[PDB]
Amino acid sequence: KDRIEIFPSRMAQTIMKARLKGAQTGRNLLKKKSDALTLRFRQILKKIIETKMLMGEVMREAAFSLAEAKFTAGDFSTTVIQNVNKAQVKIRAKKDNVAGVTLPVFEHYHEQLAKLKRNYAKAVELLVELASLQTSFVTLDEAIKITNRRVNAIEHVIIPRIERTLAYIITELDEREREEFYRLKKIQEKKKIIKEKSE
């Protein structure tokens, strides 16, 4: 609601000023975190576009090499598909760090036709980097959304609440001072009247 419901007082005013400053500092730090995450996110986005463009060439070259291979070796697709056995290239999970956010990434690891093998190995070398980039991209997107939500929540709910509480506390302390002034003025008037009575 509008106010924290701390009873007006100088101690309460000090507590609310401290809380407001702490909230502002936390908002600024989370905004810097969001800025770092967004910078890395846009860098990874540009890298993703560039890697997709480069794939546009690597995959095409590999496919044309496949056509050239089939020109000589014949219908080698059936044997290659049937003779699968065990994977010779595998993926190992790795961690990366951006601000406090952990990004998952991947490691490429090893467990005419020769040219085709080389070209598709190069294609896999490119696509593993692409997969790592896209995984980091999704993680950064989620983390950026969460942190922006935190910053917006702070600066649109918590800080206004504390500001309203501080304004109310200041007004109520002004009221206390006004009441004390009225009582003291009344006492002074009564003392003057009593002095006149004695005189």
Partner: protein, 322 residues
């Protein structure tokens, strides 16, 4: 009009007004209050259960403050006289149910319902603070709910009534099924308050499904049970059979939705709030429109039968859903 022995008789035949409007002499306001209560006491001694509506005791307190200022008395909090609390307590103490005086054994009452008008809507007001230390029931009204036209604007969180334990004896024998419904409704509202405090900062993305059901049934209770348009033929008066039937239906829906969600959390066919809402749009609208039943145009028997039919529809729809 009200029906006595099958004959309609006006309610002005039992109402007595003691009017002292805002621009009428200030010093009279105090007298007004006193006159009011005395009249009430007079009709309490006959054996009648009088009810005294003090339209605004804040105005009486303000009149006392003006007269004190003219007397150059030393003020209490916010200018009010030092005897404001004593005056309010002595006025409110005249309310209790009594065994009237005199030889014929009787039993009267004077229910004092005293509206307070805190300046600036701040309940820290000396008049409001002094009143809450005397009155046993506190129907605190919220300005935000009024602005949304959520009338009656009673703030269900801060308001309280210290007569519930004294009334369970009567509820258990006349509305035996009502006390647990009331307890569950208050639990739902408190849980919704906590979940709203969380959601305002975090959003509904991370809410547990049962938390979503709590939020949605709490919204149902707020919009379609608590709030009651008092200027309509159906919601001007809500008999207690209606007040308990509507709550029974909403709490039954809450129970069934929670049962489904909890018992199908482990299964693959996870029932969530969205599935219920899509399947039970008609039933949810019927629960929302339960308030529109007319106590007079539609008899008590018809209203009770329709609520029972809505309960049957809810049961059948949930069974067909699970």
């Amino acid at each position: 009009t009200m029906e006595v022995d099958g004959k309609v008789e006006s309610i002005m035949k039992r109402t007595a007004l003691v009017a002292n409007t805002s621009n009428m002499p200030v010093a009279a306001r105090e007298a007004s209050i006193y006159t009011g209560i005395t009249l009430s006491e007079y009709f309490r001694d006959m054996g009648y259960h009088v009810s005294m509506m003090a339209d605004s005791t804040s105005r009486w307190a303000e009149a006392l403050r003006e007269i004190s200022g003219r007397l150059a008395e030393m003020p209490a909090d916010s200018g009010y006289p030092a005897y404001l609390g004593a005056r309010l307590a002595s006025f409110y103490e005249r309310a209790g149910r009594v065994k009237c005086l005199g030889n014929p054994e009787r039993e009267g009452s004077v229910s004092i319902v005293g509206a307070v008008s805190p300046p600036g809507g701040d309940f820290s007001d000396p008049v409001t603070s002094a009143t809450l230390g005397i009155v046993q029931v506190f129907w605190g009204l919220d300005k935000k709910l009024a602005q949304r036209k959520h009338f009656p604007s009673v703030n269900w969180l801060i308001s309280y009534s210290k007569y519930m334990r004294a009334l369970d004896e009567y509820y258990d024998k006349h509305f035996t099924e009502f006390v647990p419904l009331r307890t569950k409704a208050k639990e739902i509202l408190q849980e919704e308050e906590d979940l709203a405090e969380i959601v305002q900062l975090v959003g509904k993305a991370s809410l547990a499904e049962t938390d979503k059901i709590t939020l949605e049934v709490a919204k149902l209770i707020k919009d379609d049970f608590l709030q009651q348009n008092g200027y309509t033929p159906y919601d001007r008066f809500c008999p207690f059979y209606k007040t308990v039937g509507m709550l029974s239906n909403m709490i039954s829906f809450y129970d069934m939705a929670r049962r489904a969600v909890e018992t199908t959390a482990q299964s693959d066919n996870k029932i969530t709030w969205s599935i219920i809402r899509e399947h039970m749009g008609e039933i949810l609208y019927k629960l929302s429109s339960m308030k529109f039943k007319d106590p007079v145009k539609d008899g008590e028997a018809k209203i009770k039968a329709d609520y029972a039919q809505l309960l049957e529809d809810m049961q059948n729809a949930f069974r067909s859903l699970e």
